[PDB]
Design a binder for these strands. Structure first.
Ligand code: MN
Ligand code: MN
Ligand code: MN
Length: 425
DNA sequence: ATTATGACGCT
């Protein structure tokens, strides 16, 4: 009872830009705004592959990882913006720079963990305490939460429901108790409204957000009310929310482990996990995953918000699928040089902006007909930011997968160069 | 033949 800690010590938010690459292109080209549109990579094979879809286009069924020519069959008015091509490959620079604009704004409010190009986690605990002291017992007005949903409410027109749920929540609030977790989540959500208003003011970009007590719940909440909304998931709402949440919807259970939870335990929903003891879960899924599942199904997770705004590795990848696979020495050399040239550019920019050098070069390849996504991965030193040297070293490090007697066999379906092991410069 | 990245666990 009194000693069963409930993991309500922290206020954590997950901010995620709505259809991020599409918004970046829509800011740049007003003719795309408020339209069914999508962002693609390449154009020759089937119109190119869609990696980002506006909500207007999604309403027609257009999804990521879909071919543009197929999307056009669902949505013939679909507008398409194309990723930049440099040295014969996709160049995502525009989106990395847009991402940095957003991250730098978020960083003004609290310490952030960059979780992907378009999303970050925020530890708001200190911010909420400061703000709660600032109110001096003053109650929280619905006006301060104009885009916030309270998950699970109302109980007992879309905006009409949102406001009812918010009203129920605020009326039930204990504003004098500066230690109530629900009050803390609420103040956290006020701050997140402010953060999202500043992001939209200063970039033009809209985003959604989740506010809860840990990373997994913040992330799951962010997705409940997209786009351009934020959702507060309280500790108390977890039992009902999880009672019908498919296990695969939880961060990190979307794959094989989640499938084995479902198969081994004979269950479907997150809530069913509560009926197992911790030892039972550790037995089936190992001691780490077991402890983590035993606390997660009760709404409790301790993974911290890491103070890390910048990527820990800088990478350059190109697939050579089908008949385009690289089959000669000259080919592998030229593409290693193109990849190494983009890598050099990004690394030099990184060293000047962020005062750090990478010290290790990771070369990964896929060979044709190999089942694995990484047929091989080998590392070597990264000592100077010179593309010719980096490409030569990647060759040097991979050339003994060539089984020819100036040819390359098995032909290469993927090259990948990754700079890692950063040290302050 | 969606591609292009990137974090992190396991051993
Ligand atoms: Mn997003
Ligand atoms: Mn997405
Ligand atoms: Mn995202």
């Amino acid at each position: 009872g009194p000693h069963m800690a409930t993991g309500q010590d922290r206020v954590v938010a997950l901010v995620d830009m709505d259809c991020f690459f599409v918004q970046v292109e829509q800011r740049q080209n007003p003719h795309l705004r408020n339209k069914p549109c999508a962002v693609v990579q390449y154009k020759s094979w089937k119109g190119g592959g869609i990696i980002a879809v506006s909500y207007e286009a999604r309403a027609f069924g257009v999804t990521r990882s879909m071919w543009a020519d197929d999307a056009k069959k669902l949505c013939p008015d679909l507008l398409l913006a194309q990723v930049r091509e440099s040295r014969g490959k996709a160049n995502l620079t525009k989106y990395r720079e847009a991402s940095v604009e957003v991250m730098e704004i978020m960083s003004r409010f609290a310490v952030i963990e960059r979780a992907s190009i378009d999303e970050a986690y925020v530890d708001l605990t200190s911010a909420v305490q400061e703000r709660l002291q600032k109110l001096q017992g003053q109650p929280i007005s619905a006006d301060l939460l104009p885009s916030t949903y309270i998950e699970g409410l109302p109980q007992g027109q879309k905006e009409g429901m949102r406001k009812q749920g918010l009203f129920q929540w605020l009326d039930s609030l204990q504003i004098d108790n500066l230690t109530s977790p629900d009050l803390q989540l609420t103040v956290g959500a006020v701050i997140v409204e402010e953060m999202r208003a500043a992001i939209e003011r200063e970039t033009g970009f809209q985003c959604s957000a989740g506010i809860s007590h840990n990373k997994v719940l913040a992330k799951l909440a962010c997705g409940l009310n997209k786009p351009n909304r934020q959702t507060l998931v309280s500790h108390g709402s977890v039992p009902q929310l999880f009672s019908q949440m498919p296990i695969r919807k939880i961060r990190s259970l979307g794959g094989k482990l989640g499938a084995s939870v479902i198969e081994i335990l004979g269950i479907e929903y997150m809530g069913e996990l509560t009926q197992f003891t911790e030892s039972q879960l550790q037995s089936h899924f190992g001691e780490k995953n077991g402890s983590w599942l035993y606390a997660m199904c009760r709404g409790i997770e301790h993974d911290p918000v890491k103070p890390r705004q910048l990527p820990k590795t800088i990478g350059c990848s190109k697939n050579f699928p089908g008949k385009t696979a690289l089959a000669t020495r000259e080919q592998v050399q030229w593409w290693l040089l193109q990849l190494a040239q983009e890598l050099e550019e990004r690394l030099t920019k990184d060293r000047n902006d962020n005062d750090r050098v990478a010290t290790q070069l990771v070369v990964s390849i896929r060979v044709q007909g190999d089942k694995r996504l990484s047929s091989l991965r080998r590392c070597c030193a990264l000592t100077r930011y010179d593309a010719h040297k980096m490409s030569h070293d990647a060759f040097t490090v991979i050339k003994n997968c060539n089984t020819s007697g100036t040819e390359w066999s098995p032909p290469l379906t993927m090259l990948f160069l990754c700079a890692t092991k950063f040290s302050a410069s």
